[PDB]
Amino acid sequence: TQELASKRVDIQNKRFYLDVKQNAKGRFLKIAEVGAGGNKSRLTLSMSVAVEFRDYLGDFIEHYAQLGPSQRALKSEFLVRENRKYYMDLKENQRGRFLRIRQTVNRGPGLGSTQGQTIALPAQGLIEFRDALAKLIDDYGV
C-alpha cells in the first residue's frame, strides 16, 4: 500500500490528515483525527465516495454560514455506499459548533461498531477541510 499524498488541516487546536493511498483494489482516502501521540480515529472512503462527501460538506458549510449567533443536532445527514455508512451531524456544545462524522459498516460483521471511526471537526475548519479534500480529489481523481 503506497501513499500518493497527505494534507494536514489544523483547526483550532485539533489536527486532521487527509491522505490519498493506492492498492490493487484502487485509490482511497484515509482521514485521521490526530490525538496526542497517535491517530484518535480514521475514516476510509473510496475516491468516489469522497466526491459525495465533499458535496455534503458544502451543504454543512452553507448551513453553518447561515445560522447566526447561538442562543439535538442542528443538521443530520447520512450517506451509504459500498457497505459503508457515514453519519454526519452538525452540533453545538459549550465550546462551539462542530461537525461529527462517524463511519460504520452497513451489514456483515461490525454491524454498528464505530470505534476509532468517529471524527469531530470544529465548524470553523469546514471550509478549509472541504478545500483540502477537493484539492486531493482534483489531484488524484476517481
Residue numbers in the entry: 58 to 128, 141 to 211
Publication text:
For a better understanding of the structural impact of genetic variations in the N-terminal PUR domain (hsPURA I–II), we determined its structure (fragments E57–E212) by X-ray crystallography. The N-terminal PUR domain resembles the previously published PURA structure from D. melanogaster (dmPURA I–II WT) with an average r.m.s.d. of 1.2 Å. However, in contrast to this invertebrate structure, we observed for hsPURA I–II that the four molecules within its asymmetric unit of the crystal lattice showed marked differences in its loop regions and in particular at the edges of the β-sheets. This suggested greater structural flexibility than average domain folds and most likely than its D. melanogaster ortholog. For instance, in some of the molecules in the asymmetric unit of the wild-type hsPURA I–II crystal, β4 and β8 strands formed bulges. From all the areas of the structure, the β-ridge appears to be structurally the most divergent part.
Mutations in the human PURA gene cause the neurodevelopmental PURA syndrome. Whereas PUR repeat I and II assemble into an N-terminal PUR domain via intramolecular interactions, two C-terminal PUR repeats III from different molecules interact with each other and thus mediate dimerization of PURA. All these PUR domains belong to the class of the PC4-like protein family, which mainly bind single-stranded nucleic acids and can unwind double-stranded DNA and RNA.
